[PDB]
């Protein structure tokens, strides 16, 4: 007769076990982005001209002192580091990461993108079908700035490289039931982003991993959803009266 | 066989029923609006209607005075009964109380509950069930019929 | 012209479908409109709807099925609006039912819908060898006991008048039409296409011309349910099945200097506002009388 | 008395799935025109009655705070007024309750 | 179509209920008076 | 124990070809270890079988059963999940396809009677399973008409053959 | 048990035997082993009688598969698409030959209860009985109590 | 813990059976199944019908244009050169056309010599029914032509099945004699008509009109429909017998639920008697001349 239930799931965390860890948590990347590059608002019109964009992209990279010192530190930490050979590698990494996300190849996606980038690109998409393709590249990727964060407590240097990418992509996100949700698979829509890659310099292997995806504040709004969305109002208690904002 | 019966069985007997009704009437007089079981409120409606009539008989009426003394357990309500409820119910003949069924109690008993209220009280009005306006389709058709009847004479 | 009534119906439906296709192709993309809900029940509600695609019926579906069951009319921020008419711009919506405080607009919409249904029954309840031309639906107030529709019959049909059997046949046809649920569709067209849509009824052409004259943009509102197309003022009810009680009360032959017109008066009540048998009999008896209200 | 034999599942189903034992669907459900919640046609709206009960509880709490004793009941009429209101000539001479909350829309001056 | 139950006093207004009662009462009185002389009809 | 009703909602269908009809969305939900009784919960589940979600909620609001509130909360959670996770617009366009109630792990206690006698008392627990399908509710099946009965009888007479004849 | 199992009428595939006889056995695949003692009968049958049977019946494709298996099996696939699998586990050469001949002679249909031992199409030659085939006709076709 | 492997393996077999029952796999090709040998299958197909085909002709007939296109698509997707051998498959279009023509002509001649009174529309309908998709596909499936047919989409849609069957027929016509091909056609397509009715495959619309036209051709004035016997008139299931009299001579009679249906059945019976397609007719001759 004296029998009770078991298996009550609870998630209680305390500072004592967190601080009494025998081994510190090994981090393959930093938390976020330290210095966020703020692009000028005239980039959309400047991109219409080839030389008028390329000359400015070359000038801005060279004129900044922080980018030059970061590149010098990366070169002295690891040899055979070339800025000119970087944009092709970044383009290939981005394309392969998108293909891996299409194929749901989580292992290769983990090898390519970092731990701060994988959840943001897997969380809301793990239960949906993606048909992404690469068609054309209007403008070659351009390295804008290079940043390095050095933590002397552990002697770890993390180098992040920001690359402006103007791409022509076709995206079609389906639903778990097989019905189209987001967009069509044959429309070659043009996008412009800033990919921030991160590579640990102290690590002997040091694979180039994409870390952040910066969008300009003035970027055009994303394409409308195919469905209709209803936004609920504030739920009012019986003793609370509604206030209409104006 | 319960043919021709007007009083329902409540409490532990006749005296217990009388005491329960007396307590309910005292609460109703004190608060001007109470909520209880539907059967209890329905039974108390008649006594509440009779109490106003007794109060209207005047303060010096010994029968009314002793009736109020018996019923109103809290003696501070007797002056209130004779000087507030009775004076404000003068032209009204029998429209002294309003009873409305409220939704069942949230407790596990799920009892059928009603609310009784003295008219003209200083409390927010209950959500009374209001009739449809004359601007409705059927009401407007009936208004047209009424106009035709008036014009026919 | 040597045209069968079925061929006329087919041509009208095809032309209406082509006009609707042109209207749909007028908007190439799906624009997002932010519509506020100004109703008394749920203030501050926001709907992200598709431009020229979403409808107030879809808004009611987003809210709850109770709105779809009860609400008949939509007030888009300045004017009445039928449930099956797509929205155009960002606005605010208020739903209107039969038992509202000021249901006059809904009563007018129901009156016009009943008149259109009666006209549809009359136009197709007559023999093919005879000619029947619908003139218009005279807007009489709700105080009048019956909705009226104007019909011009063949010249040889001017002697006889429909009897109780004919009225019961018309009522049965109307009830059969009600039995099948036929949504009411509203389309905004121009007089140029309305003339070719009708093209046969002189009275309808005159009505279209006089309705387009008062509109500087030459816009004619067309309503179509099933296979019947007609022009009427204002919006209509979303569903035919809303009409529960329906009767063809009487007919009155009014003779003018040019032609004689049969004014058919009928009585109807919705499912929400159905009345008792004796009340319905009294209302029908009142509706039996002549109704005269044109201006 | 004890059962003679075990009743079969078919008999049990025929007994406890009869329409008499089934829950009947209620067709008197309607929506409140005021707040849009559900209520029955012969029953007051739960939401509106809850609002009224809350307001009445607050009013009675304040009127009992005004009276320091359990047996100290007013001998005259009582009137409740909200912020931004003053007693009228017909409301003068009566016990007065003053509330910091504004006057609700459903509560009429009268 | 889950139609609800409707009685004659549900959709009427405050001013129409007495009118309906009178319109029924006088009609019933007239019908009763009409049959009061059966031998001559 | 067994947990498959929760995992039934994680299935992924291949994308629909252009031209195929839109497959209605199906949402499976379940509430585990409810103190309510199995048969009493089954009565409520049978009450709302085949009905629209709004009408089921309306009936459960005024239902006096203790499990009515639990089923109403389950339906609200299922509707919220359908709106948020699944690509299901028109939150009032759902109907209850299946609504069942099973038993769970019971608790055994001693119920005394008298003269030192006792029985085993089972604290009961029930699991509620609900399936919501996007679209209008299916129409109720009407009783067979006289014409259909006559057609079936004529067909049965016509399908006869001379048994043990050849 | 007839009520427990299924049933079928006496039928023939493609009206076999009417125009010409077609052997319904299409293929016969033996799976055996070379070291398993249970495969002794299958091995001896393959050594001795499989070639003679193949010569006698050229319309059946015979496959032989030695494999590391414990239960020697024979799979017969018929023209109906039916697959009948039998075990030749520990059987003599005579038994194997008898089973092979039985499989060859079978039509590949399901082995269930046959409702009737006969099957004739249109057995109503010269007419079929109806309640009017033996009743004489009256003059004018009048009913027994009908007056013309 | 029960020590044993036989029980575990037997339960694994049971689990496989349950999985097969729960989720049926799509049909797979017999060639793709392990035990298969195309040359042996071709030889067995030739031998089982007591016929002497040509191996090259059969291989030519058993290939299909869809199969060739699929192989070419695979070739293009893989990047290998197959134009040397894949382009020389010699699609069976000509063989199928010749088989269709010869089979239609032979069936028409057979029906003309068997039933001289059958009209042109009737014999055309009979030939079309015998060469229709359903009958030919059923014959091919029972003869395992579908298994030996080289084509994508293993279901082998009815047009592809019919094309393959008539390609085999044309290959037989080219290899053996026309008389032997006619005997094969008689044995494998006419037998499908055993127990069948003429109208079940003719599907006429106006039996009375066709009967009166046939009587006009045969110099008969007009049939008169007369009620011979009946059983109940006010009952829910009346039975009527309608007979046809030409010059007051009964030629046919038909039963029915109603008078119109009985008259239509009587007209059908009279038409069948006139055309000779009766239940009491001579059975088809299956012999070796
Ligand atoms: Mg008691
Ligand atoms: Mg004891
Ligand atoms: Mg027990
Ligand atoms: Mg026991
Ligand atoms: Zn309310």
The angle formed by the CA atoms of residues C69, C70 and C74, to the nearest 5 degrees, is 110
Chains G and E touch (3+ CB pairs under 8 A): no
CB G128 within 8 A of CB G79: no
Q: Which of B132, B145, B149 sits opposite E13 (nearest CB)?
A: B132
The angle formed by the CA atoms of residues A157, A158 and A163, to the nearest 5 degrees, is 145
Q: Which of F43, F58, F61 sits opposite D23 (nearest CB)?
A: F43
Q: How far is CA F16 from CA A175, A225, G79, H250, in A?
A: 10, 18, 38, 65
CB F126 within 8 A of CB F102: yes
Cα four-point dihedral sign A13, A14, A15, A21: negative
Look up tokens 């008036």; give the residue: B150
Query: Please, what is the end-to-end C-alpha distance for chain E in angstroms?
Result: 49
CA distance H40 to F96: 58
CA distance H166 to H168: 5
Among residues A237, A150, A213, A223, the alpha carbon closest in space to that of A184 is found at A223
Question: In a 3-state reduction of DSSP, which class is residue E5?
Answer: coil
The DSSP letter of residue B137 is: H
CB B112 within 8 A of CB B106: no
The DSSP letter of residue B81 is: I
CA distance H51 to H187: 12
* Number of domains into which chain G is organized: 1
> CB distance from C58 to chain F under 8 Å?
yes
Resolution given for this structure, in angstroms: 3.9
CB B72 within 8 A of CB B80: no
Is D14 a known ligand-binding residue? no
Strand pairing partners for F126? F34, F103
CB A163 within 8 A of CB A146: no
CA distance C194 to C220: 7
Contacts B141 to C, Cβ<8 Å: 142, 145, 283, 286
Among residues A184, A199, A8, the alpha carbon closest in space to that of A89 is found at A199
Give E1→chain B minimum CA distance, Å.
21
Candidates B130, B133, B141: best to mutate against C (most CBs of C within 10 A) is B141
What count of other Cβ atoms lies within 10 Å of the Cβ of residue G132?
A: 15
CA distance B27 to B44: 11
What DSSP element (H or E) covers G30? Answer: strand G25-32
| Two structure tokens written together for C242 | 């809303």
| Two structure tokens written together for A127 | 């239960």
Buried b (16+ CB within 10 A) or exposed e, G39-58: bbbbbebbeebbeebeeebe
Look up tokens 């092979």; give the residue: G100
Among residues C185, C243, C175, the alpha carbon closest in space to that of C19 is found at C185
Domain segments of chain F as ranges: 1-166
Cα G28 from chain centroid (whole Å): 15
CB H148 within 8 A of CB H160: no
Give D53→chain A minimum CA distance, Å.
9
Whether B114 is in a domain gets the answer yes
* Number of domains into which chain D is organized: 1
Q: What is the DSSP string of chain A?
A: --------------HHHHHT-SSPPP-SS-SS-SS-----TTHHHHTTSSHHHHHHHHHHHHH-HHHHHHHHHHHHHSSS--STTHHHHHHHHHHHHHHHHHHT-HHHHHHHS-TTTHHHHHTTTTTSEE--EEEEEEEEEEEEEEEEEEETTTTEEEEEEEEEEEEEEE--EEPTTS-B-S--SS--EEEEEEEEEEEESSSSS---EEEEEE--TTSPPPPPPSS-EEE--PPPPTT-------
Tally helices (H) and strands (E) across chain B: 6, 3
Q: Which residues of B are annotated as a binding site for Mg(2+)?
A: 3, 42
What phi and psi, each to the nearest 5 degrees, are found at residue A12? -115, 120
Question: In a 3-state reduction of DSSP, which class is residue C172?
Answer: helix
Q: How far is CA A11 from CA A8, A160, C216, in A?
A: 10, 35, 70
Question: In a 3-state reduction of DSSP, which class is residue B78?
Answer: helix
What count of other Cβ atoms lies within 10 Å of the Cβ of residue H60?
A: 19
Contacts B104 to F, Cβ<8 Å: 64
Q: Please, which residues have CB within 8 angstroms of residue G26's CB and are 6 or more apart in sequence?
A: G59, G60, G61, G77, G78, G79, H44, H48, H144
The angle formed by the CA atoms of residues A105, A109 and A111, to the nearest 5 degrees, is 125
Cα four-point dihedral sign A168, A174, A178, A184: negative
Name the CA radius of gyration of chain E, rounded.
Answer: 17
Output the CA D3–ligand 4 centroid distance in Å: 13
Q: What is the 3-state secondary structure (H, E, C) of chain H?
A: CCCCCHHHHHHHHHHHHHHHHHCCCCCCCCCCCCCCCHHHHHHHHHHHCCCCCCHHHHHHHCECHHHHHHHHHHHHHHCCCCCCCHHHCCCCHHHHHHHHHHHHHHHHHHHHHHCCCCCHHHHHHHHHHHCCHHHHHHHHHHCCHHHHCECCCCCCCHHHHHHHHHHHHHHHHHHCCHHHHHHHHHHHCHHHHCCCCHHHHHCCCCHHHHHHHHHHHCCCCCCEEEEEEEECCCCCCCEEEEEEECCCCEEEEEEECCHHHHHHHHHHHHHHHHHCCCCCCCCCCCCCC
- Exposed (0-12), middle (13-18) or buried (19+): which is C116, by Cβ within 10 Å? buried
Tally helices (H) and strands (E) across chain G: 3, 6
Give the neighbor-by-neighbor strand order of the sheet with G73-78. Answer: G61-66, G25-32, G73-78, G83-87
CA distance C245 to C267: 8
Candidates D77, D104, D107: best to mutate against B (most CBs of B within 10 A) is D77
Question: In a 3-state reduction of DSSP, which class is residue G87?
Answer: strand
> CB distance from F166 to chain G under 8 Å?
yes
CA distance C118 to C268: 10
What count of other Cβ atoms lies within 10 Å of the Cβ of residue A193?
A: 17
Torsion of CA B62, B63, B64, B65, to 10 degrees: 40
Report CB contact under 8 Å: C63, A230: yes
In terms of CA atoms, which chain A residue is nearest residue F107?
A3
> CB distance from C51 to chain D under 8 Å?
no
Query: Please, what is the end-to-end C-alpha distance for chain H in angstroms?
Result: 75
Output the CA F101–ligand 4 centroid distance in Å: 23
Output the CA F107–ligand 3 centroid distance in Å: 11
Give H238→chain F minimum CA distance, Å.
12
The DSSP letter of residue D31 is: E
Cα A15 from chain centroid (whole Å): 31
Among residues H101, H288, H94, the alpha carbon closest in space to that of H180 is found at H288
CA distance C122 to C149: 9
Fold of the CATH domain F1-166: Ribosomal Protein L22; Chain A (3.90.470)
Strand pairing partners for D80? D97
What count of other Cβ atoms lies within 10 Å of the Cβ of residue F107?
A: 13
CB C142 within 8 A of CB C108: yes
Q: What is the DSSP string of B24-41?
A: HHHHHHHHSEEEEEHHHH
> CB distance from D104 to chain A under 8 Å?
yes
CA distance H111 to H122: 10
Torsion of CA D85, D89, D90, D94, to 10 degrees: 70
CA distance B137 to C275: 11
CA distance G61 to H40: 7
CB D97 within 8 A of CB D81: yes
Contacts C144 to B, Cβ<8 Å: 144
Contacts F166 to G, Cβ<8 Å: 116, 118, 120, 123
> CB distance from F93 to chain C under 8 Å?
yes
CA distance A171 to A182: 8
Quote the strand ranges of C197-259, DSSP E: 219-225, 228-231, 243-255
Chains D and F touch (3+ CB pairs under 8 A): yes
Candidates F82, F89, F90, F95: best to mutate against C (most CBs of C within 10 A) is F90
| Two structure tokens written together for G118 | 């006969």
- Residue B49 belongs to domain spanning: 10-121
CATH of the domain at B113: 3.90.1030.10
Look up tokens 């309910």; give the residue: B24
- Exposed (0-12), middle (13-18) or buried (19+): which is C189, by Cβ within 10 Å? buried
Question: In a 3-state reduction of DSSP, which class is residue C194?
Answer: helix
Give the neighbor-by-neighbor strand order of the sheet with H250-256. Answer: H224-231, H239-245, H250-256
Q: Which residues of B are annotated as a binding site?
A: 3, 42
Ligand number nearest CA of F122 is 3
Strand pairing partners for C260? C255
Residues of D with CB under 8 A from a CB of E: 27-30, 41
CA distance C129 to C4: 10
| Two structure tokens written together for C43 | 């203030």
CA distance G69 to F81: 54
Q: Which of B135, B142, B148 sits opposite C103 (nearest CB)?
A: B135
Specify whether the backbone of A118 is left (phi greater than 0), alpha (psi in -120 to 50) or beta.
alpha
| Two structure tokens written together for E30 | 């007239």
Q: What is the DSSP string of F109-149?
A: EEEEEETTEEEEEEE--EEEEEEEEESSPPPPPPPPPHHHH
Quote the strand ranges of chain B, DSSP E: 33-37, 97-102, 113-118
| Two structure tokens written together for C211 | 């309705």
Give G17→chain F minimum CA distance, Å.
21
The DSSP letter of residue C93 is: E
The DSSP letter of residue C52 is: T
The angle formed by the CA atoms of residues C271, C273 and C279, to the nearest 5 degrees, is 115
Whether D57 is in a domain gets the answer yes
Q: How far is CA D85 from CA A242, C255, D91, in A?
A: 21, 66, 12
Q: Quick one: angle between helices H93-114 and H178-188, nearest 10?
A: 70
Among residues C110, C116, C114, C118, the alpha carbon closest in space to that of C251 is found at C118
Report CB contact under 8 Å: C47, A234: no
What DSSP element (H or E) covers C167? Answer: helix C164-179
* Number of domains into which chain B is organized: 1
Look up tokens 């392969």; give the residue: A96
Candidates C283, C288, C290, C293: best to mutate against B (most CBs of B within 10 A) is C283
CATH of the domain at G54: 3.40.30.10
| Two structure tokens written together for H67 | 């199969």
In terms of CA atoms, which chain E residue is nearest residue D27?
E4
**Which ranges in E1-41 belong to alpha helices (H)?**
16-34
Buried b (16+ CB within 10 A) or exposed e, H10-23: eeeeeeeeeeeeee
Give G113→chain H minimum CA distance, Å.
23
> CB distance from C68 to chain F under 8 Å?
yes
CA distance C113 to C235: 9
Report CB contact under 8 Å: A230, C44: no
Cα four-point dihedral sign A208, A209, A211, A216: positive
């Amino acid at each position: 007769s004296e029998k009770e239930f078991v298996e009550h799931a609870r998630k209680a965390g305390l500072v004592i076990p967190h601080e009494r860890l025998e081994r510190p948590i090994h981090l393959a990347c930093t938390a976020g982005i330290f210095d966020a590059y703020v692009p000028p608002e005239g980039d959309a019109r400047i991109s219409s001209l080839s030389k008028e964009g390329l000359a400015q992209r070359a000038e801005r990279l060279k004129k900044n002192v922080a980018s030059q010192l970061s590149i010098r530190k990366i070169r002295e930490s690891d040899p055979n580091f070339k800025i000119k050979d970087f944009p092709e590698k970044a383009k290939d990494i981005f394309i392969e990461a998108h293909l891996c996300l299409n194929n749901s190849d989580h292992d290769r996606l983990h090898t390519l993108v970092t731990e701060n980038c994988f959840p943001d690109m897997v969380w809301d998409i793990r239960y949906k079908t993606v048909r992404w393709s690469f068609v054309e590249s209007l403008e070659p990727p351009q390295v804008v700035q290079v940043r390095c964060s050095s933590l002397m407590n552990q002697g770890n240097i993390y180098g992040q490289v920001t690359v402006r990418m103007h791409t022509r992509q076709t995206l079609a996100i389906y639903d778990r039931f097989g019905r189209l949700m987001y967009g069509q698979e044959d429309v070659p829509r043009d996008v412009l982003e800033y990919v921030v890659f991160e590579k640990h310099l102290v690590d002997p292997y040091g694979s180039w991993r994409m870390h952040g995806k910066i969008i300009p504040p003035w970027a055009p709004p994303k394409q409308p959803i195919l469905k209709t969305v209803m936004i609920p109002g504030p739920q009012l208690k019986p003793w609370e009266e509604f206030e209409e904002p104006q | 066989i319960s043919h021709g019966r007007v009083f329902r069985r409540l409490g532990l007997g006749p005296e217990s029923r009388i005491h329960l009704l007396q307590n309910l009437l005292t609460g109703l007089v004190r608060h001007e609006r109470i909520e209880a079981s539907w059967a209890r409120v329905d039974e108390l409606r008649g006594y509440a209607e009779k109490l106003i009539d007794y109060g209207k008989l005047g303060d010096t009426n010994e029968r009314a005075m002793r009736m109020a003394d018996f019923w109103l357990t809290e003696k501070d309500l007797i002056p209130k009964l004779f000087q507030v409820l009775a004076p404000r119910f003068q032209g009204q003949n029998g429209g002294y109380t309003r009873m409305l069924q409220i939704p069942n109690r949230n407790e596990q008993d799920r009892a059928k509950m009603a609310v009784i209220e003295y008219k003209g009280n200083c409390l927010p009005p209950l959500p009374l069930p209001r009739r449809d306006s004359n601007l409705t389709l059927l009401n407007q058709l009936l208004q047209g019929l009424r106009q035709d009847q008036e014009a026919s004479s | 012209s040597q045209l069968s009534p079925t061929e006329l119906i087919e041509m009208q439906n095809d032309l209406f479908n082509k006009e609707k296709n042109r209207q749909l192709s007028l908007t190439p993309r799906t624009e997002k409109i932010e519509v506020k809900h100004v109703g008394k029940t749920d203030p501050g509600t926001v709907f992200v709807m598709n431009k020229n695609i979403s409808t107030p019926y879809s808004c009611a579906m987003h809210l709850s099925e109770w709105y779809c069951r009860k609400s008949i009319l939509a007030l888009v921020d300045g004017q009445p609006w039928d449930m099956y008419k797509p929205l155009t711009k960002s606005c605010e919506i208020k739903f209107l039912t039969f038992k509202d405080d000021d249901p006059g607009e809904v009563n007018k919409a129901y009156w016009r819908s009943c008149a259109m249904m009666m006209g549809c029954v009359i136009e197709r309840a007559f023999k093919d060898e005879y000619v029947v031309s619908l003139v218009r639906a005279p807007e009489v107030p709700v105080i009048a006991g019956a909705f009226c529709y104007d019909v011009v019959l063949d010249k040889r049909l001017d002697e006889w008048m429909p009897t109780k059997e004919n009225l019961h046949s018309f009522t049965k046809d109307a009830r059969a039409l009600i039995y099948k649920d036929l949504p009411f569709e509203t389309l905004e067209v121009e007089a140029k296409v309305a003339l070719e849509i009708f093209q046969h009824n002189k009275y309808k052409l005159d009505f279209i011309e006089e309705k387009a004259s008062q509109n500087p943009e030459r816009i004619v509102k067309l309503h179509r349910f099933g296979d019947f197309i007609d022009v009427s003022e204002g919006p209509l009810i979303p569903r035919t099945s809303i009409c529960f009680q329906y009767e063809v009360s009487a007919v009155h032959n009014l003779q003018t200097q040019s032609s004689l017109v049969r004014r058919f008066q009928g009585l109807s009540l919705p499912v929400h506002l159905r009345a008792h048998f004796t009340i319905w009999n009294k209302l029908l008896e009142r509706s039996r009388k002549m109704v005269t209200e044109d201006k | 008395a004890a059962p003679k034999n075990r009743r079969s599942i078919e008999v049990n189903r025929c007994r406890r799935r009869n329409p008499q034992k089934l829950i009947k669907v209620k067709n008197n459900i309607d929506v409140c025109p005021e707040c849009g919640h559900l209520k029955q046609k012969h029953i007051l709206c739960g939401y509106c009655y809850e609002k009224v009960r809350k307001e009445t509880a607050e009013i009675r709490r304040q009127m009992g705070k005004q009276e320091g004793g359990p047996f100290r009941a007013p001998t005259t009429e009582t009137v409740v007024l909200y912020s931004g209101e003053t007693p009228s000539e017909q409301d003068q001479g009566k016990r007065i309750i003053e509330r910091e909350r504004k006057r609700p829309s459903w509560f009429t001056q009268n | 179509h889950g139609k609800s139950v409707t009685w004659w006093d549900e959709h009427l207004s405050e001013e129409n209920v007495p009118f309906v009662k009178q319109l029924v009462s006088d009609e019933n009185k007239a019908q009763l008076a009409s049959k009061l002389c059966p031998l001559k009809d | 124990i067994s947990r498959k009703w929760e995992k039934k909602n994680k299935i992924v269908y291949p994308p629909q070809l252009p031209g195929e009809p839109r497959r209605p969305a199906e949402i499976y939900h379940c509430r585990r270890q409810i103190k309510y009784s199995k048969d009493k919960m089954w009565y409520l589940a049978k009450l709302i079988r085949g009905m629209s979600i709004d009408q089921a909620l309306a009936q459960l609001e005024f239902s006096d059963k203790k499990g009515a509130q639990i089923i109403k909360e389950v339906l609200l959670e299922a509707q919220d999940m359908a709106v948020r996770d699944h690509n299901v617009e028109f939150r009032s366009n759902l109907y209850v396809a299946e609504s069942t109630s099973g038993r769970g792990q019971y608790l055994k206690r001693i119920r005394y009677h008298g003269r030192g006698r006792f029985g085993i008392m089972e604290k009961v627990f029930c699991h509620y399973f609900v399936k919501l399908v996007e679209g209008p509710p299916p129409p109720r099946e009407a009783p067979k008409t006289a014409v259909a009965h006559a057609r079936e009888y004529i067909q049965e007479l016509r399908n006869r053959t001379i048994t043990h004849a050849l | 048990t007839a009520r427990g199992t299924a049933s079928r009428f006496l039928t023939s595939v493609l009206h076999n035997g009417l125009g010409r006889y077609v052997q319904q056995l299409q293929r016969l695949s033996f799976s055996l082993s070379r070291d398993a003692p249970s495969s002794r009968g299958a091995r001896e049958f393959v050594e001795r009688e499989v070639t003679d049977f193949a010569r006698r019946n050229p319309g059946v494709v015979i496959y032989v598969n030695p494999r590391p298996c414990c239960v020697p099996r024979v799979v017969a696939e018929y023209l109906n698409g039916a697959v009948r699998e039998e075990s030749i586990h520990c059987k003599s050469v005579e038994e194997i030959a008898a089973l092979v001949q039985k499989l060859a002679d079978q039509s590949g249909l399901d082995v269930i209860r046959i409702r009737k031992p006969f099957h004739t199409d249109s057995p109503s030659i010269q007419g079929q009985w109806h309640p009017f085939t033996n009743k004489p006709t009256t003059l004018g076709g009048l009913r027994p109590r009908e007056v013309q | 813990a029960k020590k044993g492997f036989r029980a575990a393996y037997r339960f694994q077999k049971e689990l496989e059976r349950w999985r097969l029952l729960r989720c049926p796999p799509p049909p797979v090709r017999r060639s793709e199944k392990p035990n298969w040998d195309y040359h042996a299958e071709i030889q067995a197909f030739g031998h089982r019908l007591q016929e002497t085909f040509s191996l090259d002709l059969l291989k030519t007939a058993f290939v299909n244009s869809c199969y060739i296109k699929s192989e070419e698509a695979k070739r293009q997707k893989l990047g290998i050169d197959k134009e040397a051998a894949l382009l020389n498959l010699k699609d069976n279009q000509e063989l199928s056309e010749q088989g269709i023509s010869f089979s239609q002509t032979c069936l028409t001649q057979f029906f003309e010599d068997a039933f001289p009174d059958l009209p042109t529309e009737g014999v055309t309908s009979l030939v079309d029914f015998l060469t229709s998709e359903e009958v030919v596909c059923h014959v091919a499936r029972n003869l395992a032509v579908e298994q030996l047919a080289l084509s994508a989409e293993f279901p082998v849609p009815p047009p592809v099945l019919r094309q393959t069957f008539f390609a085999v027929i044309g290959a037989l016509l080219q290899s053996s004699g026309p008389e032997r091909t006619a005997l094969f056609i008689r044995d494998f397509l006419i037998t499908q008509m055993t127990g069948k009715e003429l109208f079940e495959m003719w599907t006429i619309t106006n039996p009375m009109g066709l009967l009166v036209e046939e009587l006009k051709k045969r110099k008969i004035s007009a049939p008169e429909s007369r009620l011979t016997r009946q059983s109940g008139s006010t009952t829910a299931l009346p039975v009527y017998f309608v007979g046809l009299y030409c010059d007051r001579k009964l030629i046919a009679e038909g039963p029915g639920e109603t008078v119109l249906v009985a008259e239509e059945e009587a007209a059908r019976v009279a038409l069948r008697k006139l055309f000779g397609f009766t239940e009491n007719r001579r059975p088809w001759d299956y012999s070796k001349p």
